[PDB]
Design a protein around this ligand. Structure first.
Ligand SMILES: [Cl-]
Ligand code: NA
Ligand code: NA
Length: 324
DNA sequence: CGGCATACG
DNA sequence: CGTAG
DNA sequence: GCCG
C-alpha cells in the first residue's frame, strides 16, 4: 500500500465503508477544533481502507498499512470487536459536533464563524435567523436555501443544468466548451458538488468570459444567488416546481485546462496528496493552474491529465479512481 | 522535531 | 473571513 | 495523528 493517496486507485464504492466512515467522523471533529494535522491523518487512514481490495476483518490486517498508528488502529479494533467505537459515538452525540456540523454546512459559514457562534451560545438555524443583521449577504442566502441545499441532486438534474449553461456559454462566446467536473466526473450518481469548467480552444479568447456567462444566466432567471470562479445558487426545475442547487462555474485558458480539470475533479484529499507528492517527492509545485519547476523556473506544458501524471512519475488514474 | 496543498472571491 | 477541489 |  503506497503512502500517498495519488499513488493508488481509490474507487467510489469499496469494502470497508463502515470503518472509513468512523475514521472520517474523527477527522471532521478534528477540523471543528482546528486540529488540521489530526484531520489529515484520520482522512488518510480512512482513505487507505477505501483502497483495500477486501474487508478488514482482523486487527492483524492493519499491520504495515500507512497512517495506521495506535489511535486509528484502536478505532478499528473497537469496531471489529463490538461494532461501535465509543469515542466515535461520543463525538456523534455531542452538542459541539452536532452544532458545528449544522453551522458549517451553511453556505457562507466556515469553522471560525461557526465556532464563534457556538461560543456565543447559538445552537440552531432559527437562532441565526433571529439576528440577521449579524449575517453577511452570502450567509443570508445560505440560510434561506439551506433546506434545498441539504438534499443532493441526481446526475439527470446535472445534465439538465449543463444544457442551460451551454446555451448561455454559446451566446457569451461561440466555440467555448463546458466540462462537468467534481464528484459527478468521479462517477457519483448524486451529490451536491455540481461544477462546470469552461474554456475555449483559442488561447486568450476566454478572457472576460465569466461575467458574460453570468449576465446571461441571470437574464434567464436561473440565478438565485451570486473573475474566474463563480459560486452560485441556481434554480433547478422539478416536477411542478423547482429547488435551489449549488453550482460552481470556472473559466480557464486552454493552456491551463488540464490542471484545472485535474484540480476541480478532486477528490479534495486526492488533490492535497498529489500536491504534497509533487512538492515533497518530485520538487515540483502543483496548483490548479500549472506545475512549476522551481530550479529551472519553468512551467510544464500539459495537453491532458495523462501528461500531468507522466510529468509527476505517477501511473495514470482515471477520475473514477480518484475517490480518495 | 517540522510538516501537513494551494489557490480565488 | 468566505469559497473550491 | 502520523511520517520521515
Ligand atoms: Cl492537529
Ligand atoms: Na459552510
Ligand atoms: Na462546487
Amino acid at each position: 500500500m503506497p503512502a500517498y493517496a495519488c499513488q493508488r486507485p481509490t474507487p467510489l464504492t469499496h469494502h470497508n465503508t463502515g470503518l472509513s466512515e468512523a475514521l472520517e467522523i474523527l477527522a471532521e471533529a478534528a477540523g471543528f477544533e482546528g486540529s488540521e494535522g489530526r484531520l489529515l491523518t484520520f482522512c488518510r487512514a480512512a482513505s487507505v481502507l477505501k483502497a483495500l481490495p477486501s474487508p478488514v476483518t482482523t486487527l492483524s490486517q492493519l499491520q504495515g498499512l500507512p497512517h495506521f498508528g495506535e489511535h486509528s488502529s484502536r478505532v478499528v479494533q473497537e469496531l471489529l470487536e463490538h461494532g461501535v467505537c465509543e469515542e466515535v459515538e461520543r463525538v456523534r452525540r455531542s452538542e459541539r459536533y452536532q452544532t458545528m456540523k449544522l453551522f458549517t454546512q451553511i453556505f457562507g459559514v466556515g469553522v471560525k464563524t461557526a465556532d464563534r457562534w457556538y461560543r456565543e451560545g447559538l445552537r440552531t438555524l432559527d437562532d441565526l435567523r433571529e439576528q440577521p443583521q449579524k449575517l453577511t449577504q452570502q450567509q443570508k442566502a445560505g440560510l434561506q436555501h439551506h433546506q434545498d441545499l441539504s438534499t443532493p441532486v441526481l446526475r439527470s438534474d446535472v445534465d439538465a443544468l449543463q444544457q442551460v449553461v451551454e446555451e448561455a456559454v454559446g451566446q457569451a462566446l461561440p466555440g467555448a466548451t463546458v466540462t462537468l467536473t467534481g464528484g459527478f466526473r468521479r462517477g457519483k450518481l448524486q451529490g451536491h458538488d455540481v461544477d462546470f469548467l469552461i474554456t475555449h480552444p483559442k488561447e486568450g479568447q476566454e478572457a472576460g468570459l465569466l461575467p458574460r456567462v453570468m449576465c446571461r444566466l441571470q437574464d434567464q432567471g436561473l440565478i438565485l444567488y451570486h473573475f474566474e470562479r463563480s459560486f452560485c445558487i441556481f434554480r433547478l426545475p422539478q416536477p411542478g416546481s423547482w429547488k435551489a442547487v449549488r453550482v460552481d462555474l470556472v473559466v480557464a485558458p486552454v493552456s491551463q485546462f488540464p490542471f484545472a480539470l485535474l484540480g476541480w475533479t478532486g477528490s479534495k484529499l486526492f488533490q492535497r496528496e498529489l500536491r504534497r507528492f509533487s512538492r515533497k517527492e518530485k520538487g515540483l509545485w502543483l496548483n490548479s493552474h500549472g506545475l512549476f519547476d522551481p530550479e529551472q523556473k519553468t512551467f510544464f506544458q500539459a495537453a491532458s491529465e495523462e501528461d500531468i501524471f507522466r510529468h509527476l512519475g505517477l501511473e495514470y488514474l482515471p477520475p473514477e479512481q480518484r475517490n480518495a
